[PDB]
Write a protein that binds this ligand. Structure first.
Ligand SMILES: Cc1cc(C(C)C)[n+](CCc2cnc[nH]2)c(C(C)C)c1
Ligand SMILES: [Zn+2]
Length: 257
């Protein structure tokens, strides 16, 4: 089964998931001088005021904060998107060291972590159907750097003790994902894929230009999670990121000059 270790990590995924070598794989390096400003891009519409968080789950690859996606409660619209995309979960990727951890890079720079707010296109009815469509998902990617603490992240940090190992979940209601957004919604956008098997090529990526800052203490608590289940040998959940993949026949567009 796949993971991020020496023998099951990203360089092995193509043997079970041949689309790993496909035409629109993610993440990618964002070359800021090669991205083209696109004035036809609309401003993003992030409508999270009615968000209903439910649960936080350690799934052995990351932790997911899950939302009620059975109604239009927390939705992403606008930008490059047509239609309405519902937030289903968010999760992070992070490093063993502050100098690595993000999946996307910016002029080859790696951030300490990266947040993925995952949304699916309501015209496909459910998430499982959406991932089979080229415009099925819209993921808001947000970089994390280490600096000052992020107050809106602390409620996540404080529950991680209760989901240390694979398969553990905890109630996680009344969490407001607006507290994880930077000030600016300037973004790059390109067509890509899930960054984790099955690597389906169903994602419109919207990657925010402005990182959020988290404290060293906050990211240290991410690194205390476990990939393993309870009663298995402890392997710290760190470096759960896929490296940049070839851009191939894609253009990254920028919402800003
Ligand atoms: C970020 C994320 C990624 C995936 C990828 C691993 C296939 N998956 C599994 C996607 C999937 C594949 N076939 C049906 N659903 C999910 C969850 C929400 C179900 C979340
Ligand atoms: Zn992700």
């Amino acid at each position: 089964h796949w993971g991020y270790g020496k023998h099951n990590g990203p360089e092995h995924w193509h043997k079970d998931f041949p689309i790993a070598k496909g035409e629109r794989q993610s993440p990618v390096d964002i070359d800021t001088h090669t991205a083209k400003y696109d004035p036809s891009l609309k401003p993003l519409s992030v409508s999270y005021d009615q968000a209903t968080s439910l649960r936080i789950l350690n799934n052995g690859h990351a932790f997911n904060v899950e939302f009620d996606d059975s109604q239009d409660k927390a939705v992403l619209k606008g930008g490059p998107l047509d239609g309405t995309y519902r937030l289903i979960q968010f999760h992070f990727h992070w490093g063993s060291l502050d100098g690595q951890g993000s999946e996307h890079t910016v002029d080859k720079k790696k951030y300490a972590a990266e947040l993925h707010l995952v949304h699916w296109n309501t015209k496909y009815g459910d998430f499982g159907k959406a991932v089979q469509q080229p415009d099925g998902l819209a993921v808001l990617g947000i970089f994390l750097k280490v600096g000052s603490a992020k107050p809106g992240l602390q409620k996540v940090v404080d529950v991680l003790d209760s989901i240390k190992t694979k398969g553990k979940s905890a109630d996680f209601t009344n969490f407001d994902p607006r507290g994880l957004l930077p000030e600016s919604l300037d973004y790059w956008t390109y067509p890509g894929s899930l960054t984790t098997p099955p690597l389906l090529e169903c994602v419109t990526w919207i990657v925010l230009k402005e990182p959020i800052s988290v404290s060293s203490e906050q990211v240290l608590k991410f690194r205390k999670l476990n990939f393993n289940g309870e009663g298995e040998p402890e392997e710290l959940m760190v470096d759960n990121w896929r490296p940049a993949q070839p851009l191939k026949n894609r253009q990254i567009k920028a919402s800003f000059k």
